[PDB]
Amino acid sequence: IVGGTASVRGEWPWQVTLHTTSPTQRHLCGGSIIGNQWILTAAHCFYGVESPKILRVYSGILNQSEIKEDTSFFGVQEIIIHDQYKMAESGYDIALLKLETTVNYTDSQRPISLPSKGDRNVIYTDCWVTGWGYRKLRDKIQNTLQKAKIPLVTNEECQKRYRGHKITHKMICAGYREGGKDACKGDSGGPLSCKHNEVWHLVGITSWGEGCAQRERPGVYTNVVEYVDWILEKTQ
Numbered sequence: 329i330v331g332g333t334a335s336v337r338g339e340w341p342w343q344v345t346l347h348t349t350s351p352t353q354r355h356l357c358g359g360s361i362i363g364n365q366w367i368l369t370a371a372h373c374f375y376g377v378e379s380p381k382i383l384r385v386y387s388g389i390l391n392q393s394e395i396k397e398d399t400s401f402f403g404v405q406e407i408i409i410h411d412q413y414k415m416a417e418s419g420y421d422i423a424l425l426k427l428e429t430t431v432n433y434t435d436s437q438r439p440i441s442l443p444s445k446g447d448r449n450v451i452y453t454d455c456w457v458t459g460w461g462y463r464k465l466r467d468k469i470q471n472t473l474q475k476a477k478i479p480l481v482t483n484e485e486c487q488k489r490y491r492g493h494k495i496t497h498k499m500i501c502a503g504y505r506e507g508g509k510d511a512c513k514g515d516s517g518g519p520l521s522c523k524h525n526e527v528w529h530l531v532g533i534t535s536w537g538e539g540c541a542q543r544e545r546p547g548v549y550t551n552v553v554e555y556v557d558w559i560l561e562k563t564q
């Protein structure tokens with residue numbers, strides 16, 4: 329997260345860190361708890377992932393340094409990638425992880441609600457992107473989970489900034505016109521969380537952008553409301 333600030337323990341309890349263990353263990357992507365055995369993340373995260381065997385899902389983590397050889401994690405039973413996914417920039421950048429056991433919800437690990445389709449005409453004004461990613465383009469994975477408040481952008485404005493890409497209704501864009509706050513490398517797969525009537529909704533999945541926090545280049549997110557039928561179909 330560029331231009332963000334450190335989070336505190338329990339602040340984003342649906343946020344997980346997905347680690348790969350090949351050839352070494354490291355943070356790979358963010359993700360969101362949406363059910364007791366279900367993580368929603370980005371399909372791009374699994375480029376070069378040989379199988380679910382090498383994945384570990386850690387929940388309730390504030391600092392990456394909390395994760396030691398005895399830290400408990402969830403195994404991944406299945407990776408479900410959208411059938412139309414080809415590359416992040418052309419959409420369908422969404423994946424479900426089915427965990428090998430159920431998350432017991434606690435103050436540190438909690439689900440986030442999906443958007444309502446009856447809530448597709450709501451204007452979200454209180455949206456946040458979170459993650460352990462770079463604070464600038466040539467940086468390092470951060471120890472402490474970072475947060476930034478970022479405004480949503482109309483798809484018409486977003487298409488004007490990305491004339492070489494097809495910005496569709498299945499994407500949502502977010503960023504300041506002058507830049508300065510955005511997701512960056514290592515944040516993808518994590519949530520764009522928006523609060524409405526004091527309830528949090530998983531509105532976007534961090535996906536792609538041209539650089540990080542650049543002027544007039546918003547971040548592009550998978551528009552989760554457009555995938556609710558697909559999610560319910562896979563999780564039922």
Ligand SMILES: Cc1ncsc1-c1cnn([C@H](CC2CC2)c2ccc(-c3c(-n4cnnn4)ccc(Cl)c3F)c[n+]2[O-])c1
Binds near residue numbers: 516
């Ligand atoms: C894990 C790790 N560890 C060290 S490096 C790195 C890394 C490099 N790439 N990644 C991921 C894609 C790879 C997982 C498959 C990525 C790509 C793009 C954006 C992004 C960007 N960025 C553009 N240029 N950099 N970021 C801007 C706006 C938004 Cl919304 C974004 F989602 C954010 N992540 O995480 C992680």
